[PDB]
Structure formats: structure tokens, C-alpha cells
Amino acid sequence: SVIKPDMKIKLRMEGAVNGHPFAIEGVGLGKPFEGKQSMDLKVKEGGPLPFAYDILTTVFNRVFAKYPENIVDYFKQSFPEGYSWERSMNYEDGGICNATNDITLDGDCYIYEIRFDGVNFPANGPVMQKRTVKWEPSTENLYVRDGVLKGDVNMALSLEGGGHYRCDFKTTYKAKKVVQLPDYHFVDHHIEIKSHDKDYSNVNLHEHAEAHSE
């Protein structure tokens, strides 16, 4: 179709955390039917980032999820026109991040235009003190609402020395053309920073995701 077994990714994120602006660009490769992707990221403005890089990673495409034949795939169906999403990410200590991605397709390459904005992270919290280790794997629940698709997930960052820091995600996905709507289902995720330099100016990021249903 327009979807190939191997696809490319280019992105720019512009954003701010607690008022301090920054920007990151990346290029990657994904396998839409395997639900696997990897990318290399570089901080272009705002670096060395004074907050935990982890809060950014899930913002850097549910196209890269392995869907079985018996579940409607809202995301792959939405191309070549594509789709966009919006997300609120509510951390338990009152830090709040909002992000959007508008995804287009050019040849075999998805292009992301990304906005990230976080506020009210406590100065001595794990995010501003950079005390996070990784996100735990998760299960996103997806359900139709107002003719578009929502996906929510209970997320947790493992912390330095032990313990977890919780964040609730609420995402709304919006196809840019009319597509078949899915029944309620799930997407299991595991995102991981595979390598990074000391201050995360360079990051290699992976995710693998698989849909399942009742």
C-alpha cells in the first residue's frame, strides 16, 4: 500500500519545560507490521536538558504497533493522509505535560511535527533532579470517543535507588480521513533508551508494541 515492511522516520520536537525552551530532532527506522522502531535523537536547542529525558520519549506513532487481523487498525488505515494526536501526561506530584504530533507521510518516510509543553515540575522532584531510570512496560487501552480514538495508559518511571513515579496518559488520536473505527482493545508497549551520552544530547531510543483484544 503506502505502508511498507520497512519505513523511515524524521521528526522535530519544539517545546518547553517549566518555561525553558528546547528542541530535538531525530531520524529513525520502523517496522509497522512487526511493531518495532528505533531512532537516533539529538538535542538542538535548550541542552544539556535540565530535566529527565524520559519525560520526552513516548512523544517520539501507533502505526508502529503489531495488529492482529481481527482488530481494526485505525492508524495504518489513516495513510497516506495520516493522523495527528494530542496527549496530556499527568504526573503524581503535579507536573503536567501536554504534547501533540502531526504525522504526515512522504514516500517511505513518516514526518513528525511535535510540540511538548510541561509545567509545574517541582524543583526537587525526580524530573528536575534527573532521577529517573526508565519507563516500565505498559498496556494502553484504546476506545472510540466522538468518532475518533482515545488511548489511555497508566505509566511509571523507575527511580534511582528504587521506587516508582507515576504518570497518567490520556491521548486522542485523530485520523485525517474517514477510517473504520476499532472495538475496544489494548496495546502493550515497551520503550527503552538503548544508548545515550552523559547528558542525553545524543539518544538512541527503541520501542516495540503489540495490540491484543478480549
Measure the CA–CA gap between 83 and 61, rounded to whole angstroms: 10
Which residue ranges are tagged as binding site for Cu(2+)? 196, 206, 208
Peptide bond into 48 cis (omega under 30): yes
Residue 41: give its domain's CATH number. Answer: 2.40.155.10
**Residues preceding chain discontinuities in the chain with C to N over 2.5 Å:** 60
Task: Report helix, strand or coil for 15.
Answer: strand
Burial of 195 from C-beta contacts in 10 A (0-12 / 13-18 / 19+): exposed
Domain count along the chain: 1
**Could you please report the per-residue DSSP string of 159-179?**
ETTS-EEEEEEEEEEEESS--
Measure the CA–CA gap between 7 and 26, rounded to whole angstroms: 14
Contacts of 2 (CB under 8 A, 6+ apart): 79, 80, 105
Answer yes or no: are the C-beta atoms of 137 and 190 closer than 8 Å: yes
Resolution in angstrom units: 2.0
Task: Report helix, strand or coil for 187.
Answer: strand
Measure the CA–CA gap between 111 and 60, rounded to whole angstroms: 11
Rounded to a whole number of angstroms, the CA Rg of the chain reads: 17
C-alpha of 116 from chain center? 11
Which residue ranges are tagged as binding site? 196, 206, 208
Range of the domain at 94: 1-214
